[PDB]
Design a protein around this ligand. Structure first.
Ligand SMILES: [Ca+2]
Length: 121
């Protein structure tokens, strides 16, 4: 259920290259192994769930019925991360990068800090 090509995502996110010292291919890499470019991706964990192209968690970042105690850092309902517009998802991902850095994503150190030429367009 890929909803983007690696190339279209690289073009849409072109100005996020360098953001907090992030290389763009590093990020695209991270997004692919995270969500498979599926804007509707839902990953269910123990106490919580991660949503969308960026797999943003309801534990901290958005408001959801599942975690009423969430601080909702991005000030947004998690449902917004399952629509076809990734603009709000990108806003939140940047807030994550501003705080916690690219290591929020467990795919980044696992696969995206080494051998990245396949993520170029
Ligand atoms: Ca969205």
């Amino acid at each position: 259920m890929k909803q983007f090509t690696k190339c279209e995502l690289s073009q849409l996110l072109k100005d996020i290259d360098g953001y907090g010292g992030i290389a763009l291919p590093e990020l695209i890499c991270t997004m692919f192994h995270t969500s498979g470019y599926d804007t509707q991706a839902i990953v269910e964990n123990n106490e919580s769930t991660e949503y969308g192209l960026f797999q943003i968690s309801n534990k901290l970042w958005c408001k959801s019925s599942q975690v009423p105690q969430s601080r909702n850092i991005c000030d947004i309902s998690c449902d917004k991360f399952l629509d076809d517009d990734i603009t709000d998802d990108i806003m939140c991902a940047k807030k994550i990068l501003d705080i916690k850095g690219i290591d929020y994503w467990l795919a980044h150190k696992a696969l995206c800090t080494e051998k990245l030429e396949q993520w170029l367009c």
